[PDB]
């Protein structure tokens, strides 16, 4: 298989406006949302059809209760941080956990927290320690590292449980996650004069597009566009390079996607 990942995010807001929820948790397999929870619905719900059809209602009932507990814990932690920061107003607290099952068979695992969108605490499951960015985080680091058993639990979850969940969800949605739709690639001319290489209609979103001048690639001149969702489950991207009107050169677009290389000579 290709490389696949499972990630769970949490967002806590200290003083949200009337409609906005104070707590949100969403899970992803690769770029696909699989689950969602918020403090307004207070329910754990699937966001992918192959998740709903393969997990019994007991699964959603159990994690609805768990998320309600985790929602309250996240609020308590955010109250502690903003009090130690001596910050007024509304502030955000974020958590990210997940793992990757790489192509060769190896695995990675990660767990991080953020305050106001900036790194706050980062877990190292090999040294069993937390990296703190400031002294508010340093206080939390010392409290979390005093509980050696909790560090060992997080290591086991990242290396064993997370990977096990990923393989399970990978089987559930294999028709979606393990499929391949090759891109359609074209080259246009535009006076910004620059050569535009455009691809669309491909899945997975991972794709590499570069320009080459006379068989040599120089990434300084290449303008890289973002990989964007088209809305139908496929993606599109582009890359541009500016033409030299003072000398003749052979330009070519190179596109790699899912183990297939493509060259369009201009």
């Amino acid at each position, epitope marked *: 298989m290709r490389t696949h990942s499972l990630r769970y995010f949490r967002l806590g807001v200290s003083d949200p406006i009337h409609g906005v929820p104070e707590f949100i948790s969403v899970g992803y397999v690769d770029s696909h949302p699989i689950t969602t929870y918020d403090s307004v619905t207070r329910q754990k719900e699937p966001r992918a059809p192959w998740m709903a059809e393969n997990l019994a209602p007991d*699964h959603w*009932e*159990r*994690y609805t*209760q*768990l998320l*309600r*507990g*985790w*929602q*309250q*814990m996240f609020k308590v932690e955010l109250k502690r941080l903003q009090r130690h920061y001596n910050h007024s107003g509304s502030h955000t607290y974020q958590r990210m956990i997940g793992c990757e099952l790489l192509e060769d068979g190896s695995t990675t695992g990660f767990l991080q927290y953020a305050y106001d969108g900036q790194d706050f605490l980062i877990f190292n499951k090999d040294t069993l320690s937390w990296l703190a960015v400031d002294n508010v985080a340093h206080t939390i680091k010392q409290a979390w590292e005093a*509980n050696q*058993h*909790e560090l*060992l*639990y*997080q*290591k*086991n*979850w990242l290396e*064993e*449980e997370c990977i*096990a*969940w990923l393989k399970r969800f990978l089987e559930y949605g294999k028709d979606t996650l393990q499929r391949t739709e090759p891109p359609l690639v074209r080259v246009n001319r535009k006076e910004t004069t620059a050569l535009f290489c455009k691809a669309h209609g491909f899945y997975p979103p991972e794709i590499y597009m570069t320009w080459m001048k006379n068989g040599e690639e120089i990434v300084q001149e290449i303008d890289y566009g973002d990989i964007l969702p088209s809305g139908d489950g496929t993606y599109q991207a582009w890359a541009s390079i500016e033409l030299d009107p003072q000398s003749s050169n052979l330009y070519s677009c190179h596109v790699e996607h899912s183990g297939v290389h493509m060259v369009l000579q201009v």
Partner: antibody
Amino acid sequence: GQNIDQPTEMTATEGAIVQINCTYQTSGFNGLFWYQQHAGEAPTFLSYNVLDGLEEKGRFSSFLSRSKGYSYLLLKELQMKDSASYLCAVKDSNYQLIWGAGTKLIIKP
Amino acid sequence: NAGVTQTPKFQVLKTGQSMTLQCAQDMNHNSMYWYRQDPGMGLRLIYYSASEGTTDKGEVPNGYNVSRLNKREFSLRLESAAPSQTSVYFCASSVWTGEGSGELFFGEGSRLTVLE
């Protein structure tokens, strides 16, 4: 289904060493707890293991093997106060505790 | 520092009688549990409360009901007592639920005998 197994009863002599076994077959694994429960009293927390190896704690030590799915609680230098039931419990993938039936330890003076 | 306090320690009941077991914890814990213990098997969860304001069924909820009155109190209700409900009932609490290494703190237990 999910299953925990430990012996019903063990008898050892005061001052000796006793090893209480616990095997488990569960849906995922998030740790193994040992609890002590004297007759007519509340269970009290003894130890916890998630990774493989032996962890020591006074006269008691707890060992875990995740690949073999088994743990033991090791009591050294047995005293009469050690007479009790010892309960093993495992957290599954959904953080639900599955409890073993307990092992009654009888100490001969 | 009372820990987990549950009452009563003993109670005899007639079939069909109602009964409420009380449980309070002063450890500022968020998660609370109600177990029954029977000879020859492990503890079986009746109901639990992951946090203040929510409860859910356990493994053997039939014949029982609970109320998480506040953060401290978690009562267990037997509305129509049955002979099969003769057991020892333990209430427990932990700091949070879903955290891996968090252990349970048990109350002293309540022994119930239900007679025809």
